[PDB]
Amino acid sequence: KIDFEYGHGTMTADLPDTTDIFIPGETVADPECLPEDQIEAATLDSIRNPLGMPPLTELAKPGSKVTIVFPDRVKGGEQATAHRKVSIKLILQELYSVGVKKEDILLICSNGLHRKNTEKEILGVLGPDLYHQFAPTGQIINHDSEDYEHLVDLGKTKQGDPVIMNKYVYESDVAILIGHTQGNPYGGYSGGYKHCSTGITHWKSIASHHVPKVMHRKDFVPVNNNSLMRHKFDEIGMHMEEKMGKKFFCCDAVLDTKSRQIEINSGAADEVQKKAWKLGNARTYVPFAEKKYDIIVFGMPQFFHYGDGMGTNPIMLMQALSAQVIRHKRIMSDNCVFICASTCNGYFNESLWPYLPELYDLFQKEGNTLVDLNQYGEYFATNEEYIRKYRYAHAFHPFHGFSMISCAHLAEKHTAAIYLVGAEKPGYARGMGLKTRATFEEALEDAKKKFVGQEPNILALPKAFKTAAVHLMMKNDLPP
Amino acid sequence: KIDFEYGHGTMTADLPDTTDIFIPGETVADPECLPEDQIEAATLDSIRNPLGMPPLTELAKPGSKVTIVFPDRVKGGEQATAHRKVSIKLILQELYSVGVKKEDILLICSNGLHRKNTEKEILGVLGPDLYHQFAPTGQIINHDSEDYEHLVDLGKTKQGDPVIMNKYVYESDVAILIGHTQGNPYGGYSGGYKHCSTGITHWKSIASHHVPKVMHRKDFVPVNNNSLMRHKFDEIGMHMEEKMGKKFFCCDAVLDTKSRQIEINSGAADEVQKKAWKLGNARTYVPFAEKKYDIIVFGMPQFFHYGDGMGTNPIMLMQALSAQVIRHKRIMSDNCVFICASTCNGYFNESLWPYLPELYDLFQKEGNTLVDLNQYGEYFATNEEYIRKYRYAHAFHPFHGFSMISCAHLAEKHTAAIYLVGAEKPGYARGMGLKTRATFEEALEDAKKKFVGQEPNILALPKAFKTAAVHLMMKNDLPP
Amino acid sequence: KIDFEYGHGTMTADLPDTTDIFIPGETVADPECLPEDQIEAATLDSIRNPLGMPPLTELAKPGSKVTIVFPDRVKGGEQATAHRKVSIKLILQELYSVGVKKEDILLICSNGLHRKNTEKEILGVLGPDLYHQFAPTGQIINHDSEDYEHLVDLGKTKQGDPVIMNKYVYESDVAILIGHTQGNPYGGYSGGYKHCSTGITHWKSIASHHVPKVMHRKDFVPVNNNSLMRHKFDEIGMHMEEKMGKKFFCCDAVLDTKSRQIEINSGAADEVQKKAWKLGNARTYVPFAEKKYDIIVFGMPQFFHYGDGMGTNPIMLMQALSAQVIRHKRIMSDNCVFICASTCNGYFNESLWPYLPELYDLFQKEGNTLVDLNQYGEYFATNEEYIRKYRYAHAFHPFHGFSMISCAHLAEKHTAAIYLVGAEKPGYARGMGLKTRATFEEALEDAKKKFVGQEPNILALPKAFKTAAVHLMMKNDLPP
Amino acid sequence: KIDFEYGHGTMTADLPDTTDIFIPGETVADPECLPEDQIEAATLDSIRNPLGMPPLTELAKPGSKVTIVFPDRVKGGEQATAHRKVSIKLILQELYSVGVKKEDILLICSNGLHRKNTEKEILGVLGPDLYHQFAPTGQIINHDSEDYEHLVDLGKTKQGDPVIMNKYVYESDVAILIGHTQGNPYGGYSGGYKHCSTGITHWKSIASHHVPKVMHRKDFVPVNNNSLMRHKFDEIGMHMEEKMGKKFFCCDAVLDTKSRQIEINSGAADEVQKKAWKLGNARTYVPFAEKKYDIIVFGMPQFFHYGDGMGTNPIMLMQALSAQVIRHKRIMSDNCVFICASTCNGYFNESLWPYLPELYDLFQKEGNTLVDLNQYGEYFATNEEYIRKYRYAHAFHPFHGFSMISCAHLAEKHTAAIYLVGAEKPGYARGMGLKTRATFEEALEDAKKKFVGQEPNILALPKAFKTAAVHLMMKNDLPP
Ligand SMILES: *C(=S)c1cc(C(=O)S)c[n+]([C@@H]2O[C@H](COP(=O)(O)O)[C@@H](O)[C@H]2O)c1
Ligand SMILES: *C(=S)c1cc(C(=O)S)c[n+]([C@@H]2O[C@H](COP(=O)(O)O)[C@@H](O)[C@H]2O)c1
Ligand SMILES: *C(=S)c1cc(C(=O)S)c[n+]([C@@H]2O[C@H](COP(=O)(O)O)[C@@H](O)[C@H]2O)c1
Ligand SMILES: *C(=S)c1cc(C(=O)S)c[n+]([C@@H]2O[C@H](COP(=O)(O)O)[C@@H](O)[C@H]2O)c1
Ligand code: NI
Ligand code: NI
Ligand code: NI
Ligand code: NI
DSSP: OEEEEEETEEEEEOOOTTOEEOOBTTTBOOOOOOOHHHHHHHHHHHHHSOBSSOOHHHHOOTTOOEEEEEOOTTSSOOSTTOHHHHHHHHHHHHHHHTTOOGGGEEEEEOOTTSOOOOHHHHHHHHHHHHHHHHTTTTOEEEOOTTOGGGEEEEEEOTTSOEEEEEHHHHHOSEEEEEEEOOEETTTEESSTHHHHHHHTBOHHHHTTTSSHHHHSSTTTSSOOSSOHHHHHHHHHHHHHHHHHTSOOEEEEEEEOTTSOEEEEEOBOHHHHHHHHHHHHHHHHEEEEESSOEEEEEEEEESSSSSSTTTTTSHHHHHHHHHHHHHHHGGGEEEEEEEEEEOOOSSOOOTTTOTTHHHHHHHHHHTOSSGGGGGGGHHHHHTOHHHHHHHHHSOOOOHHHHHHHHHHHHHHHHSOSEEEEESOSSHHHHHHTTOEEESSHHHHHHHHIIIIIOSSOOEEEETTTTTSOOOEEEETTOOOO | OEEEEEETEEEEEOOOTTOEEOOEETTEEOSOOOOHHHHHHHHHHHHHSOBSSOOGGGTOOTTOOEEEEEEOTTSSOOSTTOHHHHHHHHHHHHHHHTTOOGGGEEEEEEOTTSOOOOHHHHHHHHHHHHHHHHTTTTOEEEOOTTOGGGEEEEEEOTTSOEEEEEHHHHHOSEEEEEEEEOEETTTEESSTHHHHHHHTBOHHHHHHHSSHHHHSSTTTSSOOSSSHHHHHHHHHHHHHHHHHTSOOEEEEEEEOTTSOEEEEEOBOHHHHHHHHHHHHHHHSEEEEESSOEEEEEEEEESSBTTBTTTTTSHHHHHHHHHHHHHHHGGGEEEEEEEEEEOOOOSOOOTTTOTHHHHHHHHHHHTOSSGGGGGGGHHHHHTOHHHHHHHHTSOOOOHHHHHHHHHHHHHHHHHSSEEEEESOSSHHHHHHTTOEEESSHHHHHHHHIIIIIOSSOOEEEETTTTTSOOOEEEETTOOOO | OEEEEEETEEEEEOOOTTOEEOOBTTTBOOOOOOOHHHHHHHHHHHHHSOBSSOOGGGTOOTTOOEEEEEEOTTSSOOSTTOHHHHHHHHHHHHHHHTTOOSTTEEEEEEOTTSOOOOHHHHHHHHHHHHHHHHTTTTOEEEOOTTOGGGEEEEEEOTTOOEEEEEHHHHHOSEEEEEEEEOEETTTEESSTHHHHHHHTBOHHHHHTTSSHHHHTSTTTSSOOSSSHHHHHHHHHHHHHHHHHTSOOEEEEEEEOTTSOEEEEEOBOHHHHHHHHHHHHHHHHEEEEESSOEEEEEEEEESEETTEETTTTSHHHHHHHHHHHHHHTSTTEEEEEEEEEEOOOSSOOOTTTOTHHHHHHHHHHHHOSSGGGGGGGHHHHHTOHHHHHHHHTSOOOOHHHHHHHHHHHHHHHHHSSEEEEESOSSHHHHHHTTOEEESSHHHHHHHHIIIIIOSSOOEEEETTTTTSOOOEEEETTOOOO | OEEEEEBTEEEEEOOOTTOEEOOEETTEEOOOOOOHHHHHHHHHHHHHSOBSSOOHHHHOOTTOOEEEEEOOTTSSOOSTTOHHHHHHHHHHHHHHHHTOOGGGEEEEEOOTTSOOOOHHHHHHHHOHHHHHHHTTTTOEEEOOTTOGGGEEEEEEOTTOOEEEEEHHHHHOSEEEEEEEOOEETTTEESSTHHHHHHHTBOHHHHTTTSSHHHHTSTTTSSOOSSOHHHHHHHHHHHHHHHHHTSOOEEEEEEEOTTSOEEEEEOBOHHHHHHHHHHHHHHHHEEEEESSOEEEEEEEOBSEETTEETTTTSHHHHHHHHHHHHHHHGGGEEEEEEEEEEOOOOSOOOTTTOTTHHHHHHHHHHTOSSGGGGGGGHHHHHTOHHHHHHHHHSOOOOHHHHHHHHHHHHHHHHSOSEEEEESOSSHHHHHHTTOEEESSHHHHHHHHIIIIIOSSOOEEEETTTTTSOOOEEEETTOOOO
């Protein structure tokens, strides 16, 4: 009896007593996070002694325009001592010390193609103090990847990747990036060059890497720190750095499963990435599996990663399954079977993803596999209604969904079969290529009969999505 | 490089040179069909010398009411020397020899839950001679399982099985069942007791055996001559014989893969079944395979079996896949993979199956598997509009579709995965639980990577639905 | 420059000066119609001296139930001296002369499958005298072919023809059929045995002869007095006479092109038909053409024959074209081309023919030719909503439309091509299989280029539908 | 017994034994294709020895911008030694030899109003080597006739033809057109000035000749080499040539039925056309017919020419019929009949042609003939949704459909009747003015009865659309 996430709660699975249960942070201890009394001091020390650039004192002159670009509510923590709040607070104190005016500081939420964070979401992300400091003056803005008035086209990179970036960050004298060095199937880790290359860029810039051309090759599944997606992240980052004539001050903190800071690294994006990747690999790449697992059992809540309906939207849940594939491919056998509890009730969450019903209909009409949809990316990404919903209705940018399906296809690709149990509308899961069973037990027996045999190595991931999911490797494997 | 049925033509698969190809009737020779000149003599000898039941001349008095119940266009063949035409002509000659009035003979098409054969279809089935002999007088009637003015309820059997049969057959004094002892996933063979128990019955009688409670038991896959399905067929047949006060004259011919008569058997249904079962097993239960087959590759044409759209309608498509499962389970590995070519263009053929769009939508809304739909059988079977379309619009009876899903779930249950290639609308195939690939090669590589390994035993089945399919067994297997 | 019917008016065709113009009743003189002064005297003499049946005075006992079945507004005259009004008035006077009670007389409008005539239409048909004499007491009833409470099933005929007739006519003691001997594509002439067999029967009785099985044989085009259609008419008529125990008093008047009486024939239906055949052939079978006509040019008004939309509804449009084919087949060349003006504006007249939009949609969905629709006849004929609209909303009976398409296919079958000119919505005409051109000149040039050559024999038929059409034959042809 | 294309396969026709069967390349031997070992050498010799201009070495300076404009997947073949792949490879080698940088070379797919080729289609067209060489850097772009950022308006010609052309080709120092001098009803042949005038121009430029005002005159049907369409092609080509100050280097190869190279010619467009014209006339204009054919029998596959649904979309199907008309006018009698097998199942392929459902509805509700639609061309061509689907959803440009109907009208104009055989939804074929018959035999008998007589000259074209269809002439006719 193992409880797995099911929509809003838990559904029980009668898994065998030999099933291995892994919970991030719990089953294998993450690197010890900084104590609460020490988190602020560590962040201040990181800011005051950066890597690859002089501190914010030398970079910022009195009266200089400063853009502090912080990540949205998808990643990071919202506690009183969260990395975003503490880091932005001490960075603002440092800026005020050197004479940088408060009215000349812009807090930019790096949603990128994700939904623009609402006022309450921004308040929760930044904390009451920072929000009430900057929101009344309009000094907290969500990045708009479709507001070309506040976007600068920087041309293409040496590899042909277009670069359109946030105008406030472009014209600012000091661009600071609050980042979380958390485990991410997209490029290995969040923050660093990924933060700038995605959260404050265009869908066209993101289309260079968030496509099957780079995330359906060998280097993406399982993810590493030197995949093509991360390479394009770095390329776009340094391209914008050359275009502005300045480099991003990347205040990035490695976070544990509970989004608590383990270490904080500030300075140059590449220096910060290199310095933080050691602890990021100690926390994210967990050598836990003693044997390859034939069945991976987990549960999908309705609201884990990108908001409500993330575990009920067929495309969003397929992308979550694919993210699990990228995370645990190192411990997955060739014929691995995913058994996921999801309330696939047809709740697409059109408020969050208005384009996803039409993307799903396009997949049903044309696509044998989700990769067949990639040709329509721009078609959604230039859709005026979806663009308007992203810009004003706090919806995800349309092209994000293609990134989603660009990830989601790996779920169909790298698993023998994926079982979705408890689907209230199993037709949507089947339309995403998932086998549908009413309960965990029937899917378990079906997988044993068809793909994995009567004595499979079953891995249970009860908190696969409600927690910061680590990427599992073999016990003898070393963190890449 | 093997062509497989695909819509109205063929799709070519670049299968490995080690792929074994089986064409029913060509790869393994059928029992030698009777010559065209000898067919009439053999049928006349069988009719004049029936088994375990008095000859037709000894059953019908002058002025007797005779019902010749012939099968519909789905099986039997429509050649000049087809069993239906020749057998009915000789039987009518014998009846006129004992002075049976022509006006007292009714030709009943035993569609059962299948669509009432149109006048053109009846003409093609019976030959111009028989048609223009009996059609202008209105003596050829399609059996109506929903015309209760022409239905007689015989009550429950000894096992509580509801029997409602055609009123013309019940009230006649001589009922002559024209039958084809041909390979059939339902009950082993066609004709005999199955002919009466299905073709001239109510949907409630079919619900007794076409329920998953009888189709999904361990004795149905692969189908044999002693399955529960045939048991209910026989029970309903002898219930008819007891309530009617007369015995069916089962003029049955064993047919090869080209619908040519090999031997004609007349007399009581039980005796005809016992005598013709040996040659039926010789023709159908073919001991061909020397090894278990990991991949079974075939193609689905748009038109086959029940009519147009059978290879495109998702539910009929799954029923055809499950029929293949039933027929070839003896040569299948536990992780067997189906790779079928089907256009799957969303052509439900509402004229043939108007209830099937609603059934598919119900499957998507509620059903994890197709068995979840069975509780709605009566709901479709009593649907007024679908009943009207079956009675007058020459549509299939609604409950027949449930029989299909009752069969079709087996395709999901037994195969590890079924690949559909060439799907114009892959969404319907995926909503049936099928993996969708654009071409045969992609599905083959996917099956090799996921289920069967890089060196699978691949069986090619070209014309698997164009010709009368056989039940493939291992070389050392004995015919049931 | 000849004006042809077009919607509510005329369209001019710049036909060659060699075009022959035929106007029924004008180009060839009709038999001299009875002048208004002696019309009453002739009708009274015919009624008092019937043919092969006793006079009405010798048939109706005092206080006996009498049903006067008069035809609807589709055919016959509506003037003061119209056959229906005068004949019914004189018959009622004769009945009152022998003491037959006024209350015991029922005036039945024999619509059959045609729309029940409204109270206004019944008044116009019967005259104010007869209407206000019998309407206020409810003694004028439209025949309801779907009011089984007022229908009597007489069973199949000797030819297997189902007969269900009006209950009032069946249960009456004297049934008097008012009839018009006029040019009719159905059965040669109207009235007589056709009157009873169609105007007061069930749709099942009409289905015996109004299907392609009877309308599309070689003996129907051109139509005569010895076609199979007339044979079924006679068989159903004598079946009605035999089951009733009484003989129809067929008070029939031969009508010219202006619906004026030429001679009145009363008595048995067979004897009346024999007596009136000569003058019916003289009026209808006109030997006018001295050569075969390659192009037949006529115009279709919006209102004619069955009512509004007849020239605009695609199916009634094809039925009118096929009626023209049937009437003018004797003068038609093998490759004859019809060029018809019609406002094919998509006005289906759902009030008149609610089943016809569905019938046309079915034809587009699966009908290569209109005969492909015949299998659905009962499906429309048993449709509850269409039956309700026929019974209460004064709509045509659904199966009547099938009769129309049963006729209408002839237009497709016999003409090389039919050109519709002036169609506001040419798509409906094309979906009926008609070539569409904007003007008469374009269609004429197209027909000359494609089928008939640059010097065709063009026949102009203005008012081909406004006047009672004739069956044109060659000058040397004899009248059947 | 001749098999003609039907949907995804073939259907059989019981044509008379006197029916003449023509297959391009097979029935009449095409000019001998260049051997595979000699194709590359001949292409290199052609590029190194151009006509009308100096070679690419003398035209391209080191660092000069070069646009290699290649045709889409519709024609040209995709074999390993196809003209596009080999020609582009050797041309790139020559450019690298003279010092032209790889980053300064743009591979432009000249889709024109045709759908932008997807990444997979571009890969298949160009070969894996060329694709992976230029695709990752974004150096392969589809021509966008609606991206005015990358379009240059060159004004009108001397005849008022608007000229808007691809901006990359305009600003490039060397424009190299890869061309296929294969049979084409549009202007006689592809490549040369047609390639530039259509594949990299605006819909407004194409509207000068793709309207009925140009392709419905005497010269277009039958197509010749001096038709007005080719004249306007030449005019637009030289207009763009003078506008850029450079002339197109037309590397054009003549192709056989199997798209294999027969002769490769490079240099100026007019000189290339003149040189390749003899081979193009030898391969394309085949003097095969000994007598004019009253019936031409062929069949449409679902996929051919412009993609999926070409044989099922009613407008696309009718345009294919018209292309056959233009191809075989020289061997076609005045009362010619087309009998084409097509699965006219209503599959419009909205993905390929989203505007064609609404264009078809416009034809049904307004158009007597297809020319009546031409006034709405710009209305579709400026439709924002259809433009977006062409630009991003890989759909055909809207105005292309009008070109299609501009061709398609000839099918109605130059044939007495066209019989569409086996239509699943015959209403669409009838709405395109085509006679619909269920089987080949029905259409054959109908055509014999109506248009061509009982002993017609029947031509069979079993591979009319699955191969590069030649234009047939009389055996005494010289190639124009
Ligand atoms: C990672 S792929 C990523 C992608 C996007 C897109 O728009 S696609 C946006 N972001 C934003 O960058 C911040 C932190 O990155 P993380 O990897 O999501 O944790 C955050 O604001 C993201 O929304 C990231
Ligand atoms: C087989 S299970 C079967 C089922 C039905 C139903 O209605 S369910 C009807 N029939 C008819 O019986 C005839 C011959 O049987 P066959 O197995 O189809 O060959 C024939 O008329 C069937 O339609 C059979
Ligand atoms: C002629 S076929 C016919 C058919 C019908 C049908 O219902 S179908 C009905 N009637 C009616 O009989 C009366 C006179 O016949 P006529 O040929 O129409 O003049 C008249 O009331 C008809 O409506 C006739
Ligand atoms: C021929 S008329 C033609 C028309 C167009 C239009 O947009 S209309 C486009 N093209 C493209 O030019 C290339 C080769 O020409 P072909 O005649 O098709 O072989 C090719 O890319 C065409 O798509 C041609
Ligand atoms: Ni992203
Ligand atoms: Ni059955
Ligand atoms: Ni009638
Ligand atoms: Ni073109």
